């Protein structure tokens, strides 16, 4: 299993670069392979644009994530084959993304000005 | 905030012609003056701006040696002299703040 | 320098009819681009910033809108006071470039 916990200091996963499979043949109690807690300033698992990561055996734990948005964990579970036709993962609603907006607007830029040493925007 | 500009202009060929731009209703060291003109009856083409904290500038090529730009930090106001007229005929010179407020236009003649 | 080709030139058209102006982008600009409206007295006016957004205090009945290279100005219902001229700006690269411009004039 994978396990992230109290990692106060990660922003995102994508360091472990490579890693395409996680077997699951052992597991943390309550039969989980990848398990994330109390990570506050996680706001990236993989870029799911193009990381492929496939999980064979056992559930998913997120609690305490707050800057990591359900969408990102929504994805891993489509993505890592944590299925919906199975059985659970002990995700929390309240405590993923509760202190992000994730994305939701768009600003414009309404002026653009370069200079061989300067840019001004608007 | 008003880019409020100067002339009728009416100039002999061979002589230089300074048109002002006097801007008020905002702090004038923040944002840029560009400059464009249009020939009646046709299109605008983009002379050049300033940037008037710094004083720097960028010309069209079109435009280099003719146009030369200045700013009057002191009085807010912005000029554009232009060089050795000859029939240009008539042409209508606007200043604009970054392209959201334009100046009303002065006719040089 | 990126060309900016308006069409059409000119426009007849009556009070309360939509219509449609574009303007084609020779290289890609983005979003980066403005609609400006001119008066007879000469007053320009910026319509449009970023392709789409509206100016504080332009009649709603105003939109800009893109698709593909083509950039469109929309005046939903037209009014009187809106039979003028009307001219697109890139700035998307360092020479700044205008469109040539659109009469609309009343049919």
């Known amino acids: 299993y994978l396990k992230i916990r109290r990692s106060y200091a990660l922003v995102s996963l994508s360091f472990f670069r490579k890693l395409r499979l996680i077997r699951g043949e052992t597991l943390e109690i309550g039969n989980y392979s990848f398990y994330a807690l109390d990570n506050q300033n996680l706001r990236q698992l993989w870029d799911w644009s193009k990381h492929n990561l496939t999980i064979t055996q056992g559930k998913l734990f997120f609690h305490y994530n707050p800057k990591l948005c359900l969408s990102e964990i929504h994805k891993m579970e489509e993505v890592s084959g944590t299925k919906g036709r199975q059985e659970r993962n002990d995700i929390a609603l309240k405590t993923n993304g509760d202190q992000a907006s994730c994305e939701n607007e768009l600003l414009k830029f309404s002026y653009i000005r370069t200079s061989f040493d300067k840019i001004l925007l608007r | 905030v008003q880019l409020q500009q100067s002339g009728p202009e009416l100039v002999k060929p061979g002589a230089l012609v300074k048109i002002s731009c006097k801007a008020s209703?905002?702090?004038?060291?923040?944002?840029?003056i560009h400059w464009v003109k249009q020939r009646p009856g046709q299109g605008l083409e983009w002379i050049g701006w300033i940037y008037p904290g710094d004083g720097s500038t960028k010309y069209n090529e079109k435009f280099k040696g003719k146009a030369t730009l200045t700013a009057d930090k002191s009085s807010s106001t912005a000029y554009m002299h232009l060089s050795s007229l000859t029939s240009e005929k008539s042409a209508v010179y606007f200043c604009?703040?970054?392209?959201?407020?334009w100046g009303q236009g002065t006719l040089v003649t | 320098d990126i060309q900016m080709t308006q069409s059409p030139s000119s426009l007849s058209a009556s009070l309360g009819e939509r219509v449609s102006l574009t303007c084609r982008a020779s290289?890609?600009?983005?979003?980066?681009l403005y609609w400006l409206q001119q008066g007879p007295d000469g007053t320009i006016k910026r319509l449009i910033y970023?392709?789409?957004s509206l100016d504080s205090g332009v009649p709603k009945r105003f939109s800009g809108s893109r698709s593909g290279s083509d950039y469109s100005l929309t005046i939903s219902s037209l009014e009187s006071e809106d039979f003028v001229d009307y001219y697109c700006?890139?700035?998307?690269?360092?020479?700044?470039?205008f469109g040539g411009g659109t009469k609309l004039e009343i049919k």
């Open positions: 604009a703040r970054e392209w959201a407020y």
């Open positions: 290289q890609d600009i983005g979003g980066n």
């Open positions: 209703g905002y702090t004038f060291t923040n944002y840029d």
């Open positions: 970023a392709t789409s």
């Open positions: 700006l890139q700035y998307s690269s360092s020479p700044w470039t």
